[PDB]
Design an enzyme around this catalytic site. Sequence first.
Site, short mmCIF file in Angstrom:
data_model
loop_
_atom_site.label_atom_id
_atom_site.label_comp_id
_atom_site.label_asym_id
_atom_site.label_seq_id
_atom_site.Cartn_x
_atom_site.Cartn_y
_atom_site.Cartn_z
N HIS A 141 -1.19 40.47 -20.93
CA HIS A 141 -1.82 39.56 -19.93
C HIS A 141 -3.24 40.03 -19.55
O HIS A 141 -3.56 40.19 -18.38
CB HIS A 141 -0.89 39.41 -18.72
CG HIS A 141 0.29 38.55 -19.02
ND1 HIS A 141 1.55 39.06 -19.19
CD2 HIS A 141 0.42 37.20 -19.13
CE1 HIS A 141 2.41 38.07 -19.37
NE2 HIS A 141 1.74 36.91 -19.33
N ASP B 11 -4.48 33.72 -15.87
CA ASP B 11 -3.70 34.95 -15.59
C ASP B 11 -4.57 35.99 -14.87
O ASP B 11 -4.32 37.21 -15.00
CB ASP B 11 -3.13 35.54 -16.87
CG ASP B 11 -1.80 34.96 -17.33
OD1 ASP B 11 -0.97 34.60 -16.46
OD2 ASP B 11 -1.62 34.89 -18.56
C1 ILZ Z 1 13.81 34.76 -24.50
N1 ILZ Z 1 13.79 36.01 -25.17
C2 ILZ Z 1 14.82 36.87 -25.26
C3 ILZ Z 1 14.38 37.93 -26.04
C4 ILZ Z 1 15.15 39.12 -26.27
C5 ILZ Z 1 14.58 40.16 -26.95
C6 ILZ Z 1 15.26 41.35 -27.18
C7 ILZ Z 1 16.56 41.46 -26.76
C8 ILZ Z 1 17.17 40.41 -26.12
C9 ILZ Z 1 16.47 39.22 -25.83
N2 ILZ Z 1 13.07 37.73 -26.48
C10 ILZ Z 1 12.74 36.53 -25.90
C11 ILZ Z 1 11.49 35.85 -25.90
C12 ILZ Z 1 10.24 36.62 -25.64
N3 ILZ Z 1 9.16 35.86 -25.11
C13 ILZ Z 1 8.12 35.75 -25.90
O1 ILZ Z 1 8.15 36.32 -27.00
C14 ILZ Z 1 6.93 34.99 -25.47
C15 ILZ Z 1 6.44 34.60 -24.25
C16 ILZ Z 1 7.00 34.71 -22.91
O2 ILZ Z 1 8.23 34.81 -22.74
N4 ILZ Z 1 6.13 34.66 -21.86
C17 ILZ Z 1 6.51 35.13 -20.48
C18 ILZ Z 1 5.19 35.90 -20.48
C19 ILZ Z 1 4.83 35.31 -21.82
C20 ILZ Z 1 5.22 33.99 -24.56
N5 ILZ Z 1 5.03 33.96 -25.88
N6 ILZ Z 1 6.03 34.56 -26.41
C21 ILZ Z 1 6.10 34.76 -27.80
MG MG Z 2 0.75 33.61 -16.51
ZN ZN Z 3 -0.87 33.36 -19.82
#
Ligand code: ILZ
Ligand code: MG
Ligand code: ZN
Length: 313
Positions: A68, A107
């Site tokens: 961020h 942000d």
């Molecule tokens: C939903 N989930 C669950 C797991 C997981 C991983 C390891 C073990 C268990 C569960 N990984 C994800 C998704 C991660 N989110 C991202 O990758 C993401 C975001 C994002 O969430 N936002 C909030 C600030 C940015 C933005 N762009 N991208 C690529």
């Molecule tokens: Mg944000």
């Molecule tokens: Zn953002």
Amino acid sequence: GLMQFTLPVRLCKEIELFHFDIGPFENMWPGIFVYMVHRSCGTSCFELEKLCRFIMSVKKNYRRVPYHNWKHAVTVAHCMYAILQNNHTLFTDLERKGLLIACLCHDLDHRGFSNSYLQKFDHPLAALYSTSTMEQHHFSQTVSILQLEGHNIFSTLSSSEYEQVLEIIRKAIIATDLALYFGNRKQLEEMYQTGSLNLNNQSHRDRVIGLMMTACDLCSVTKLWPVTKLTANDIYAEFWAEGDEMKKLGIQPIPMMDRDKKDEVPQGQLGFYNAVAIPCYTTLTQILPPTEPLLKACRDNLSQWEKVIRGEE
Ligand SMILES: Cn1cc(-c2ccccc2)nc1CCNC(=O)c1c(C(=O)N2CCC2)cnn1C
Ligand SMILES: [Mg+2]
Ligand SMILES: [Zn+2]
């Protein structure tokens, strides 16, 4: 007045594409932003001196966090640039002015922690702003910097135009709270599918701009696979630090934030592409057909995470 910004040829060509990576030369990012403002808004939208001062104060108020950070601000602005340039005639003069600025500021002063961590820590911001805690802070930081001497890039606007642009920026920044995206997209889906979607309807335009904000915010999933993959490392570097901080408050974090569950990142990406990203770019493409390249690039990346799960990388 006769002073254009011009980029080297590869950047001049590739900046027009959705999947452009702004690169690792931090010192070129202000110039890349001014270039995009000039082409998407005009050389007349902002006094160059005020704009440069505004940009450098915005940079100063992004922190040295893994994800961020100032690079994310400029990356999100570039995705917005590409949407606006591919939808020449759909947007107002105030919208072209406000949206790149909103993206650069969305942000501001981020600490690398979620709204949920701030509420569990009982951070002062969580008492000042009970929902969309960081996003209200980001808008607040935007107004602060706009009110610094010689930082008022909107000074040529009328009182009511100024109020409208700040209201576009506020709604655009609040819309980057992903908690708000699910319902926004469901409403846009229903509106599109019952044919009730009306871009003369202000509340509809607000919903469409909100979805553009989610799309630009999540745009790491629309890059070339090596960009996507290396960006995800920065995202998790933040999440895992938040997970550590949750454990310090005596709270088991969600697996997404627990570095002990690294191994499940690939399956975590699949859920995210299927629940958040693909639906975002699908609805955006339905409303703004020339944004299809984002949906196409997101599907290519989903296929790459599937290959990771199959141990083909
Ligand atoms: C939903 N989930 C669950 C797991 C997981 C991983 C390891 C073990 C268990 C569960 N990984 C994800 C998704 C991660 N989110 C991202 O990758 C993401 C975001 C994002 O969430 N936002 C909030 C600030 C940015 C933005 N762009 N991208 C690529
Ligand atoms: Mg944000
Ligand atoms: Zn953002």
